[PDB]
Ligand binder design. Structure first.
Ligand SMILES: [Cu+2]
Ligand SMILES: [Cu+]
Ligand SMILES: [Cu+]
Ligand SMILES: [Zn+2]
Ligand SMILES: [Zn+2]
Lengths: 155, 155
């Protein structure tokens, strides 16, 4: 019982490019996201499930902004605030930060305790940001993830 | 409601050195380990609660081995096997791998869903390994963490 999500680096100009996958499985403590990515910059990267099952760009202030088609952080319970994966009054789509090693790969799995069944995340997207995630809207909103760097649609 | 564990880099020959702390707090989904460490090798490192509240070395084949005085992974339920943090039949002391950035620091918190109350971890030790953790006893025992790099006694 799993969902393999194809993830691509976002490039509204020359076209998105494959960088691997993220496999979602169920554990007795929540959904587990196991990455198998490469070609990314080393460090911690914001990692959240977004509203729409789309990784396409959107016009914003005359510019084609990468990944805006995915909408905001998935928040079906209306928490209206960014937080920790283990915080109840935070976007349900807030996952633990992704770790990209010196060699540009990410294979360390992370758990989202608030997510319980695979079908619950189908029909949405998974987003990887250029920046990190301090799990707060302070001092930077949405954890300070910044630009949408990679994305995949959850089938 | 927290426990601030002082962590030291282990070196029996030259002397241990302080590398920071690991703060343990309770969340509605389990214990959260928030590191504030520096001076460590970049990459993912095995992170586990060991049985004894000691970070002392022990002689192992004409070679004083670092942190062996901590004994094995804390396994109060007798799982007798290394696994994932979200796996019920794995050592209870099995925590998510710790991320140390290129700059040698670690501040990314991780959740131990199977650990529910602070008092449970008191009287034991927290260990950070040189190698990572594939959360299995194969192809290497105990996730392949290998040598014990840093350690702290949990009061
Ligand atoms: Cu590096
Ligand atoms: Cu996001
Ligand atoms: Cu260990
Ligand atoms: Zn969020
Ligand atoms: Zn273990």
């Amino acid at each position: 019982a799993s969902i393999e999500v194809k993830v691509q680096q976002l490039d509204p100009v020359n076209g998105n490019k494959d960088v691997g996958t993220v496999t979602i499985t169920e554990s007795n403590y929540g959904l587990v996201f196991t990455p198998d990515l490469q070609g990314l910059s080393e460090g911690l990267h914001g990692f959240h499930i977004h509203e729409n099952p789309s990784c396409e760009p959107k016009e914003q202030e005359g510019q084609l902004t990468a990944g805006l088609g995915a909408g905001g952080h998935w928040d079906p319970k209306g928490a209206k605030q960014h937080g920790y994966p283990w915080q109840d009054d935070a976007h349900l789509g807030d996952l633990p930060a992704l770790t990209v090693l010196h060699d540009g790969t990410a294979t360390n799995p992370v758990l989202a305790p608030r997510l319980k069944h695979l079908d619950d995340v189908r029909g949405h997207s998974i987003m990887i940001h250029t920046g990190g995630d301090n799990h707060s809207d302070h001092p930077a909103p949405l954890g300070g993830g910044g630009p949408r760097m990679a994305c995949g649609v959850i089938k």
